[PDB]
């Protein structure tokens, strides 16, 4: 069988799928199936500071030229009608203890997606909370202090991970997206997994950030681009432009404090218990979108998403 269960295990993957399956066991719903969480890619990368910011702070020695991180691609599958369905995919960026500031001990949830066929429908949000909250708890135990989430609102026909979304899987508005993550984070705050969370604007204000070299620099994030455009415009201060852009989009950006204050200062180095997992199909989101486009693998209906997950799984086992 080329099932998701037969894909190599990881500490992270089995920690997450245990959290989901314990939850589903307690619910004891007849429509629910066994869930599989697999880390299908893990590789070391670096994000280079862009020219505008490089000239302003890197050439003057005020900021690092590049920040090293580990990128992981984790997928969740559920058994529906005897076959696996991939219903959740996430690409993360992890900036460890050997990363120069302002990026050290930070995790960035770059782009996230899902296919709304999780059965039963009533347990869908709860299962996503187990996955996201479970990931925050996991990295918090390894020594990561902060979590960052850009809830980038999608647009019709724009897929982040899964090619051809169901026509009725609706595109949430920024207000809806902010509300979902607020409810999710409020749940982690009450379970004592998260210390507290704030929007990016409230966060920069209460951290007393005065320079753009203090803002964490993430691969593909909105803020490395805002900074380039702000500098370019100012060539025709940077800090007031940054605070203005943060005020306008604060509802989409979350900063999540996992390890707060005193505990955060006496921390040992971050050591990942799992090995690196090469997989060029999951090296970023474009490889799997490209493959699904060329091979006509759609996730627009339940059976189409089940057939696509099957092809996806034989590609993952073949490497
Ligand atoms: C006319 N038809 C067409 O255009 C068909 N068509 C539809 C799309 C389309 C739809 C959805 C999405 C995308 C494209 C993007 F890839 C990303 C996205 N996928 C995804 O899961 N979200 C998060 C989301 O929706 N959450 C939050 C959430 C969910 C899971 C999770 F683990 C953490 C958070 C909800 C529960 C919310 F209600 F809270 F918002 C996306 O926004 C493209 N085409």
Swiss-Prot record:
* Phenotype when changing residue 110 to R: Loss of activity
Residue numbers carrying N6-acetyllysine: 50, 187, 213, 241
**Consequence of mutating residue 283 to R?**
70% decrease in activity. 90% decrease in activity. 90% decrease in activity
How is the polypeptide modified once translated? Acetylated on Lys at up to 17 positions by intermolecular autocatalysis.
Where, in this chain's numbering, is acetyl-CoA bound?
A: 112-114, 124-125, 171, 176, 180
Which locations, inside or outside the cell, does it occupy? Answer: Cytoplasm; Nucleus; Chromosome
- Looking at the record, the residues that make up the CBP/p300-type HAT domain are 1-319
Chain segments annotated as transmembrane:
none
Annotated region described as Interaction with histone, given as residue ranges: 111-113
Function (record text): Functions as a histone acetyltransferase and regulates transcription via chromatin remodeling. Acetylates all four core histones in nucleosomes. Histone acetylation gives an epigenetic tag for transcriptional activation. Mediates acetylation of histone H3 at 'Lys-122' (H3K122ac), a modification that localizes at the surface of the histone octamer and stimulates transcription, possibly by promoting nucleosome instability. Mediates acetylation of histone H3 at 'Lys-18' and 'Lys-27' (H3K18ac and H3K27ac, respectively).
Pathological association: Defects in EP300 may play a role in epithelial cancer. Chromosomal aberrations involving EP300 may be a cause of acute myeloid leukemias. Translocation t(8;22)(p11;q13) with KAT6A.
Quaternary structure and interacting proteins, as annotated: Interacts with HIF1A; the interaction is stimulated in response to hypoxia and inhibited by CITED2. Probably part of a complex with HIF1A and CREBBP. Interacts (via N-terminus) with TFAP2A (via N-terminus); the interaction requires CITED2. Interacts (via CH1 domain) with CITED2 (via C-terminus). Interacts with CITED1 (unphosphorylated form preferentially and via C-terminus). Interacts with ESR1; the interaction is estrogen-dependent and enhanced by CITED1. Interacts with HIPK2.
Q: What is written about domains in the entry's comments?
A: The CRD1 domain (cell cycle regulatory domain 1) mediates transcriptional repression of a subset of p300 responsive genes; it can be de-repressed by CDKN1A/p21WAF1 at least at some promoters. It contains sumoylation and acetylation sites and the same lysine residues may be targeted for the respective modifications. It is proposed that deacetylation by SIRT1 allows sumoylation leading to suppressed activity.
* Entry protein name: Histone acetyltransferase p300
What species does this protein belong to? Homo sapiens (Human)
Q: Which residues of the full protein are shown?
A: 1287 to 1661 of 2414
């Amino acid at each position: 069988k080329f099932s998701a269960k037969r894909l190599p295990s990881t500490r992270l993957g089995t920690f997450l799928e245990n959290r989901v399956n314990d939850f589903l066991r307690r619910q004891n719903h007849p429509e629910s199936g066994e869930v599989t969480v697999r880390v299908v890619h893990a590789s070391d990368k670096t994000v280079e500071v862009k020219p505008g910011m490089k000239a302003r702070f890197v050439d003057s020695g005020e900021m690092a030229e590049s920040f090293p991180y580990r990128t992981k691609a984790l997928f969740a599958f559920e058994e529906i009608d005897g076959v696996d369905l991939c219903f959740f995919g996430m690409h993360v960026q992890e900036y460890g203890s050997d990363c120069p500031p302002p990026n050290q001990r930070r995790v960035y949830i770059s782009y996230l997606d899902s296919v709304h066929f999780f059965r039963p429908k009533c347990l869908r949000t709860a299962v996503y909370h187990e996955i996201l909250i479970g990931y925050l708890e996991y990295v918090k135990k390894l020594g990561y202090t902060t979590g960052h989430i850009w809830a980038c609102p999608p647009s019709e026909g724009d897929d982040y991970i899964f090619h051809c979304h169901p026509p009725d899987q609706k595109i949430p508005k920024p207000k809806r997206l902010q509300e979902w993550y607020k409810k999710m984070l409020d749940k982690a705050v009450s379970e004592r997994i998260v210390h507290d969370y704030k929007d990016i604007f409230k966060q920069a204000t209460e951290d007393r950030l005065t320079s753009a070299k203090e803002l964490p620099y993430f691969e593909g994030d909105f803020w490395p681009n805002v900074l380039e455009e702000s500098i370019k415009e100012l060539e025709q201060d940077l800090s007031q432009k940054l605070y203005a852009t943060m005020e306008k989009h604060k509802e989409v950006f979350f900063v999540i404090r996992l390890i707060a204050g005193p505990a955060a200062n006496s921390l040992p180095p971050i050591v990942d218990p799992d090995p690196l997992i090469p997989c060029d199909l999951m090296d970023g989101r474009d490889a799997f979108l490209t493959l699904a486009r060329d091979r006509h693998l759609e996730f627009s209906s339940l059976r189409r998403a089940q057939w696509s997950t099957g092809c996806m799984l034989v590609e993952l086992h073949t490497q």
